[PDB]
Amino acid sequence: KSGTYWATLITAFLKTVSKVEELDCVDSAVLVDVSKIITLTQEFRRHYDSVYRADYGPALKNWKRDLSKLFTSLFVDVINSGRIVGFFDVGRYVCEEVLCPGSWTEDHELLNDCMTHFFIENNLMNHFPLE
């Protein structure tokens, strides 16, 4: 869909997982997709924990300066729904574990822009059918 729609969706998703008190009104379609994405990322994390012992914590301590490297590398050889869900799960992790929940700070905006630019630049909406 629309590039603006996805920019809107990403921000909405990040604000929701960040537990931002202030509700930034969005269409019902956007909320529905935010819901679907949160559920997916939790299923994804469930698989990650079954296969690996490590948390994302260690590698994401320098996220503000390496997150982009991680996203490029995540899609270096191919793009599929599963890696895209992992993409959002990395985002959910940062908002839930690293950053503080309940406030939308400059670091959040940094995360938001990083994810939004990479998503759109790499045509990820083309391989991410929320059906």
Binding site: Y48, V51, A59, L70, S73, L74, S81, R83
Partner: peptide, 19 residues
Amino acid sequence: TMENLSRRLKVTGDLFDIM
């Protein structure tokens, strides 16, 4: 390393579409 996490996420993403 961020590179290791990257391999683990790809492994999980690839196995996600399956399992």
